[PDB]
Nucleic acid binder design. Structure first.
Length: 196
RNA sequence: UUUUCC
């Protein structure tokens, strides 16, 4: 069951320790009401600092599945990218999708879709949390990801998002498209317009 | 200025 008891966590804060990450996830699991017993659901964390990802190992298949609901949670300003291991395949009797919804957690999986938005020209000093806040001002988000350099972790100055209410899409465009900030000017438009 | 092991 081990492949079904581990998760990839990407975009982790620079310099974070394995025990700091374990404490964070154990606390979040209990605060969200996802822990299915006394004691810690997360048994171990293994971090690769050079490449900036971690793998979490859980005591339970079901608690592993519930933890998928934390995808996008902000940790020291960064959107944690929670994913299955690539060699995971659902088991018999187990369900692969989370039973729960953690309030305020915004998924990082933003599928191409009608009202998926592109936001370009962002100031380079804004982190995942601040950019998400910029967009949440117009309405609650269904999904969001700020694109970062895979080696340095620095922002690439563009993001994608999807609002819960499809009608907020045009309000966010009207509020943000063409806004000038120094050298740069925001481009905010449905991502299909400028995609390849 | 179209999301990264054992």
């Amino acid at each position: 069951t081990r492949q079904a008891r581990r998760l990839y966590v990407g975009n982790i804060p620079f310099g974070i320790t394995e025990e700091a990450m374990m404490d964070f996830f154990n606390a979040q699991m209990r605060l969200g009401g996802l822990t299915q017993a006394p004691g810690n659901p997360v048994l171990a964390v293994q971090i690769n600092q050079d490449k900036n990802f971690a793998f979490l190992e859980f005591r339970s298949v079901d608690e592993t599945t519930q933890a998928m609901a934390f995808d996008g949670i902000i940790f020291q300003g960064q959107s944690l990218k929670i994913r299955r291991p690539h060699d995971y395949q659902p088991l018999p009797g187990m369900s692969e999708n989370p039973s729960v919804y953690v309030p305020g957690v915004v998924s990082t999986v933003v599928p191409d879709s009608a009202h998926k938005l592109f936001i370009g020209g962002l100031p380079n000093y804004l982190n995942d949390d601040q950019v998400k806040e910029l967009l949440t001002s117009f309405g609650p988000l269904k999904a969001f990801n700020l694109v970062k350099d895979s080696a340095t972790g620095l922002s690439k100055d563009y993001a994608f998002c999807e609002y819960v209410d499809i009608n907020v899409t045009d309000q966010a465009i009207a509020g943000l498209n063409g806004m000038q900030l120094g050298d740069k000017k925001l481009l905010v438009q449905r991502a299909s317009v400028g995609a390849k």
